[PDB]
């Protein structure tokens, strides 16, 4: 068949087998839908100056990608190397880019992980096709897209890392996904939802006694929120809504149902939202009560016609942190496994005191981010020069933009031992001005011994009852 016709029949086979869901026959009625999607995005360019069908690009499955690929790769779908550069080097100057690759990615989007030992919510997000499952990250996410099947434009894959055992890459996305399923128009909350406004709701957060009659729903502008906290079994994160700002009252709330954990990814500060089917709880010793989500809670965006308001020192170096909020872009790394970074170079940035792990596999130069409620310190220990931000649970970290820059090289000297820095912080509970030095030390010991007298993954391993870590014993007498 003709080049375009051969491309089309290859796409037919690809759809039928690789993509057509087990829930539905290898329906050919699906093929015109995806054909229309590729045609749309390709011709709507105009700049494409191409055949009706983009024959240059090709189709790749999840498992296909997983087995075959191991470089970072970008499908800046339907863009020329000129437009690509104009996007890639906007994270420049000299932003070492991902490579331009002409692939098309089609798959189902869900929170459900590939594991079935539990629900395995863990606030995680994944792409699934007939071939395999893969985790993904998505700026300005829309939760409605859950469970739906899409074409993905302007998409990027990051490979697993040499040091990492799980050997899993992950996806990064730059634009809304297009559903193969025709536009699924659905109604909205016509009736004004009965919600408690922030003043009455906060008075209730003090006077937990008066939670009767007024519907257990809420609304307001998101003023404050935690990072996604995890216990050893429970996971949760806290948020607060204000009538305005500066406002007399803000309503603190906690999300805690495992299935709802994904909610965390969606919200954003300032934007006003609506919460539903709530209660107020008294966590152990937390006398200032909070609203909490139930088995039936739902979260929604706020819209005027959709609400029904309801009202009832050189002499003593002990120095102070300055709470603030900030945004910008990281510009390097000083110790990836521990968690240090240079925000625009000007200002030190730790990150240790979070659960943090979820942010590792993204964080790299050219990443743009926003911080809310974050301690700032100066003149810190170890003679370190710059000021240092240092988010903590009462704060939260927010992505502005993924980085067009590809990751740098591996090197055992840099890549190893995250568990050890973490173990220090949580078993010993140091304070940051001591933790900076407690890095620089192990960075100097592993400059003598390793690898020759002893290899890193023997020296820096996280100390365990089965064996103490030499990277802990050597410091202990000074530290303790």
């Amino acid at each position: 068949p003709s080049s375009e016709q051969a491309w089309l029949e290859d796409a037919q086979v690809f759809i039928q087998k690789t993509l057509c869901p087990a829930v539905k026959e290898p329906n050919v009625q699906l093929t015109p839908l995806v054909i229309d999607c590729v045609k749309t995005v390709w011709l709507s360019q105009g700049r494409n100056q191409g055949s009706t069908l983009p024959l240059s690009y090709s189709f790749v499955s999840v498992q296909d990608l997983k087995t075959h690929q191991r470089l970072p790769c970008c499908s800046h779908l339907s863009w020329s190397s000129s437009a690509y550069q104009a996007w890639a080097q906007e994270a420049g100057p000299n932003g070492n880019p991902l490579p331009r690759e002409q692939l098309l990615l089609l798959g189902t989007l869900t929170d459900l992980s590939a594991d079935l030992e539990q629900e395995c919510r863990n606030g995680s997000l994944y792409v699934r096709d007939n071939t395999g499952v893969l985790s993904c990250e998505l700026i300005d996410l829309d939760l409605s897209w859950l469970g739906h099947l899409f074409l993905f434009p302007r998409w990027s894959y990051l490979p697993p890392a040499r040091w990492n055992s799980s050997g899993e890459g992950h996806l990064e996305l730059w634009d809304a996904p297009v559903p193969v399923f025709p536009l699924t128009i659905s109604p909205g909350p016509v009736t004004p939802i009965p919600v408690l406004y922030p003043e009455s709701a906060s008075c209730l957060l003090r006077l937990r006694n008066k939670l009767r009659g007024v519907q257990r729903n809420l609304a307001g502008s998101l003023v404050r929120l935690s990072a996604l906290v995890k216990s050893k079994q429970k996971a949760y994160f806290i948020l607060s809504l204000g009538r305005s700002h500066p406002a007399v009252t803000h309503v603190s709330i906690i999300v805690q149902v495992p299935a709802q954990l994904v909610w965390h990814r969606a919200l954003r500060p300032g934007t006003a939202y609506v919460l539903t089917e709530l209660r107020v709880s008294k966590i152990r010793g937390q006398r200032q009560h909070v609203w909490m989500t139930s088995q039936s809670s739902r979260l929604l965006l706020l819209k005027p016609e959709c609400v029904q308001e309801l009202e009832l020192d050189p002499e003593s170096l002990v120095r102070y942190s300055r709470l603030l909020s900030y945004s910008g872009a990281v510009t390097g790394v000083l110790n990836e496994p521990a968690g240090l970074y240079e925000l625009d170079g000007q200002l030190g940035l730790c990150l240790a005191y979070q659960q943090f792990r979820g942010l590792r596999r993204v964080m790299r130069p050219g990443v743009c981010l926003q911080l809310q409620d974050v301690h700032l310190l100066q003149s810190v220990g170890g003679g370190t020069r710059r000021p240092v931000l240092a988010p903590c649970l009462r704060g939260a970290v927010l992505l502005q933009s993924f980085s067009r820059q590809k990751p740098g090289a591996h090197s055992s000297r840099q890549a190893y031992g995250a568990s050890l820095y973490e173990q220090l912080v949580w078993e010993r509970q140091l304070g940051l001005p001591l933790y900076l030095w407690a890095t620089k030390a192990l960075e100097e010991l592993a400059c003598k011994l390793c690898p020759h007298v002893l290899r890193h993954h023997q020296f820096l391993q996280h100390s365990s009852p089965g064996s103490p870590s030499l990277g802990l014993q050597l410091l202990a007498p000074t530290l303790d």
């Binding site: 100056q49 191409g50 055949s51």
Partner: protein, 67 residues
């Protein structure tokens, strides 16, 4: 002919954009070893006869015969 001419023109565009259609030549990037060799040009290069490098196929034979 639209598709055919489009394809041949993509090829011709690659070629011409790569070809120095006018003006003087330009210097391509140079790597560490290449620049160092160029700077060292005048050095007599290290080399070894292939004889010292196991031209003795008989020794190869009786070696591969060993367990």
């Amino acid at each position: 002919m639209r598709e055919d001419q489009e394809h041949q023109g993509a090829l011709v565009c690659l070629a011409e954009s790569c070809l120095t259609l006018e003006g003087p030549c330009t210097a391509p990037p140079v790597t560490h070893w290449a620049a160092s060799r160029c700077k060292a040009t005048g050095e007599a290069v290290y080399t070894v006869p292939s004889s010292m490098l196991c031209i003795s196929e008989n020794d190869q034979l009786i070696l591969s015969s060993l367990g």
